[PDB]
């Protein structure tokens, strides 16, 4: 059910602020896959410091074996969005209700993603 799953380590923060009361864009590089990721995360409700390691997973549906549109107990930062731009080392542009995500990796790593489809975002900081 999970299409892409890898451990990511953050590199730097765009605002670099602890109490800016603003959405923070993070830059995390994939391990053993060499993939760069942009993601807008809320630090106040989900703290993320530099050097932390977190897993990431993407699935079309949260149900087991079908029923598109019970993985909630495993992860803690579930999101929902759609992929609108696929043109690039291919990269993906997924917006979770205005929160842009840029997953830039290799053409072979990302090949089973269609255009204008709904996908989730499973995250856990170990």
């Amino acid at each position: 059910i999970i299409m892409f799953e890898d451990i990511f380590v953050v590199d730097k923060l765009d605002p670099d602020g602890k109490k800016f009361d603003k959405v923070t864009r993070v830059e995390a590089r994939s391990h053993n896959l060499e993939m760069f990721m942009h993601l807008d995360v809320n630090t106040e409700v989900y703290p993320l410091a530099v050097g932390d390691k977190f897993t990431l997973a993407m699935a079309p549906t949260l149900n087991l074996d079908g029923t598109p549109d019970t993985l909630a107990d495993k992860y803690e930062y579930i999101m929902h969005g759609k992929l609108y731009k696929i043109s690039e080392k291919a990269e993906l542009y997924v917006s979770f209700g205005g929160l842009l995500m840029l997953l830039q990796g290799d053409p072979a790593h990302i090949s089973h993603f269609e255009l204008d489809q709904r996908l989730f975002l499973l995250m856990r900081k170990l």
């Binding site: 009361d21 603003k22 959405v23 807008d40 809320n42 106040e44 409700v45 989900y46 949260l62 909630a72 992860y75 803690e76 930062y77 579930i78 999101m79 929902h80 969005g81 759609k82 609108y84 917006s95 979770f96 209700g97 205005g98 929160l99 842009l100 204008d116 709904r118 989730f120």
Partner: protein, 96 residues
């Protein structure tokens, strides 16, 4: 166009689309849905915290219930992309 949003609706739309850090819960979103003519979008925010239930709605989806499903809008200057009646991206400028 002859008619604009006004002096208050403009500021309210700016505050809705700029903050991006205040999430509206189910009750407030359903209360605000009474005025909007279109239906309710998916929450897009299932879990914002490990111990946070009651999945919430983002602020930019609230402004997305003001466009027809067939209406598509693109504004390269402010990086505003509206596809299938949903606001996808917005950075700053408030020029559109």
């Amino acid at each position: 166009n002859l008619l604009s949003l006004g002096q208050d609706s403009l500021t309210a739309a700016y505050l809705v689309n700029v903050e991006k850090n205040c999430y509206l819960n189910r009750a407030q979103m359903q209360q605000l849905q009474m005025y909007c003519p279109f239906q309710l979008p998916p929450p897009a925010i299932i879990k914002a915290s490990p111990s946070s239930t009651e999945p919430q709605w983002t602020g930019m989806q609230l402004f997305g219930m003001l466009f027809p499903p067939g209406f598509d809008y693109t504004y390269p200057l402010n990086n505003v992309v509206v596809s299938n009646g949903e606001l996808l991206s917005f950075s700053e400028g408030s020029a559109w």
